[PDB]
Symmetry: C3
Subunit: 303 residues, 3 copies
């Protein structure tokens, strides 16, 4: 009615075939055009190569789109950063003003769950920002996942955020958190965060069985699977931390706040590391798409 | 149903899809002194009606939740004053069970308005993150209520007695859409200037109505805060409101005024300190919220 | 469906008879076998003796059980601490791995509410941890009760936690909190917390009337009734505080974190008080079962 679902996604959902939701803010605010389009195409190709149907979610001319046509992807990507970064709380406004919106994890969660997609691949999830006891700056991603029964496939949480506090917040929100094939919770750019994972899963089939259980119980809280970036693609943790500290200070000084903050910080860290962090970001999203697609296929086979 | 009493005019309005504006009752019982509390409530209901909407003041009377009050009930409530229980959402069941009188806060009024399908709720200010919440965790259930109730709250922002930046952050985490009306600055109740940028902006009642309408069609289970800056000619910005507020906060700490006694103490003391100016501003902003809120409700009714 | 409800509980729910939910972690994590089984039997007997059907909740071989048979209670008791401490966010995982789980307050709430049980007797509820300002360590019991319309019967909150902040957090979550026949909020082992109770109820009938109103209103938030430990069983606040202070220091030095912290502290306080604290813990659970049952019976009669 209000939501436009692509034929291919619509067909897969009707037949119980694997579908993987994808967000669009990485396209609009994660990298420049046409690299953004290239990375988005590659991710969707990895999803299809591993047996799932990719469902990139966005809002175009006020219409929520679940699954984008090639034309729509190209159009969105070419708009670049002029597209509105759209969290869940922004959806109604972008719809009402007939605008274009690139959806974050919290908005993408909402639409994916709405149409019955169970697996959502992202790069990293928002979290508790550093010094949140002074700011209370905490991503709506965490509350959204706490009340949306969907599995988010991430590479953990970036060190621009407070990882230990983000893990505590997720526990309080009743989100099941598990690291993939590791006892150590990953830190996005780097495989190791310094925090033990609260739980562990060792295969795509293991992940699918937890999701299946969650669905059967009708629990209204979600799941975060954290897939460590492949060791060969992991960025040096001292280079990342040094760039991160500088970026955080610059954000504070230039009064970058609210939803402008994460995009500002990730872009600055990429500048400061001469491209190394963006390259790792691209690597982990591709790895997440691979594992995420395998989970969705396993889940489809269970059901 | 058998427990909630809906006034005939509100009942008819809901059945026919007419514009309805919910109103809370704690501003009457605990928010303002006895002549102005009743006078203001009557003036607000009149502004709502004059602009084409039906006012639905919500309260609990002798254990009965009432949605829409008669002039007599409004009179009865204003005079009972603070003998009525200040009733947050979490207190409703208790007040009903004990057959008490309760003046409903934003969190309680939200619950009842949403229950019967009212989409627009006009208030003065919303509760928020209290100052020093890092040592207390004192945070209004208004914020959590709005985060899980699909209704639009029309306020004049957040008072500086609270921590405005942290309140804005908390609302974002709860997925509440926040927009300032015809301004880039988030307003601060008595005064238009909070020092904080508005996270979003809307420029007409019709624009507000379109956001609410989209939110309803999407079936999102989170609400909206529209923050209407107090009209420039009624602002208390010129009256040392921030100084008076700071002095009031300090005096409350020294006299151990806490809990439900605090806000009334602070409001009375700030009014003393500003020679009546802060109360006048409070009256002005609630009336302005009623005007814009009614216009939003009417535009929404027309959309639907 | 997926949940196994015992015949006695099922029959009681079908007939609108009083049912009291109970958790299993004190069996699993509170004391050694076979005394642990005898205590569990004594608590269930208090429930039956006061006119209600006890519904002990646990997960056995991946199956959620609401109401345990004699054989099932024996198996749970013999597993001892080898059972997984299962919060709400752990349920899907324990189900998926076919594990045994002792459900905490947050997990037990979910299952009791699912099948229409209105009264859940516990000992104490989890809360805001001390120094939560630097850790954000806050029990999911609080968020669970804020979105589950069920009454929890507790003896308040232990002083190992931050009681004032716990009370504030509950207000924020819209949980109605009332002390039973007292103006002072109780502190688990001890009747006095130092905090005024936010509200008060003076009989099981009063409690049932609040629950009945909450049910008729269809509010989706729960209730915490805090029943002070009987005066003759109350532990002295200075022998508790001494043990408590030492236990807290030790947990900090041994870097005990996450879901291990509360079980560590309670076990250590019990060690340091030579059994006095566990004795008080058993006394308050038995008192809670008595009052809880009377409330559940009064509620059944109202309905
Ligand atoms: O490399 C990236 N990680 C994460 C984001 C986005 O940032 C959001 C968090 O932003 P905020 O907490 O302001 O809502 C996440 O949901 C995600 O969509 C992004 O654009 N690029
Ligand atoms: O003697 C006790 N044993 C176990 C608990 C459990 O601890 C939980 C809180 O721990 P956490 O916040 O870490 O989930 C409670 O739900 C309860 O089931 C308790 O409170 N008291
Ligand atoms: O959760 P509650 O207690 O209702 O919110 C805190 C503040 O919200 C307002 O209504 C009151 O003035 C109170 O001080
Ligand atoms: Mn933020
Ligand atoms: Mn408060
Ligand atoms: Mn914890």
């Amino acid at each position: 009615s209000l939501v436009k679902i692509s034929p291919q996604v619509s067909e897969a959902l009707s037949n119980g075939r694997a579908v993987v939701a994808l967000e669009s803010t990485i396209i609009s605010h994660g990298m420049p055009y046409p690299q953004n389009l290239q990375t988005a195409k590659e991710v969707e190709s990895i999803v299809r190569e591993n047996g799932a149907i990719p469902a990139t979610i966005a809002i175009l001319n006020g219409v929520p789109c679940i699954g984008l046509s090639e034309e729509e992807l190209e159009r969105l990507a070419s708009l670049g950063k002029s597209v509105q970064k759209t969290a869940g709380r922004d959806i109604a406004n972008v719809v009402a003003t007939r605008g274009n919106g690139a959806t974050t994890v919290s908005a993408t969660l909402f639409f994916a769950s709405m149409v019955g997609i169970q697996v959502f691949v992202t790069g990293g999830i928002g979290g508790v920002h550093r010094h949140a006891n002074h700011s209370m700056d905490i991503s709506s991603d965490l509350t959204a996942l706490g009340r949306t029964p969907i599995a988010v496939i991430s590479a953990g949480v970036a060190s621009i955020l407070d990882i230990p506090k983000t893990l505590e917040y997720l526990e309080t929100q009743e989100v099941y958190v598990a690291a993939y094939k590791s006892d150590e919770f990953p830190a996005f750019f780097t495989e190791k965060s310094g925090c033990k994972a609260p739980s562990r899963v060792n295969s795509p089939e293991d992940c699918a069985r937890v999701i299946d259980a969650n669905m059967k119980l009708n629990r209204q809280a979600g799941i975060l699977f954290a897939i460590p970036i492949p060791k060969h693609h992991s960025a040096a943790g001292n280079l990342i931390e040094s760039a991160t500290q500088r970026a955080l200070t610059e954000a504070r000084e230039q009064n970058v706040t609210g939803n402008a903050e994460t995009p500002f910080l990730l872009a600055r860290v990429n500048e400061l590391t001469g491209g190394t962090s963006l390259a790792a970001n691209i690597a982990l999203v591709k790895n997440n798409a691979l594992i995420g697609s395998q989970i969705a296929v396993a889940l489809s086979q269970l059901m």
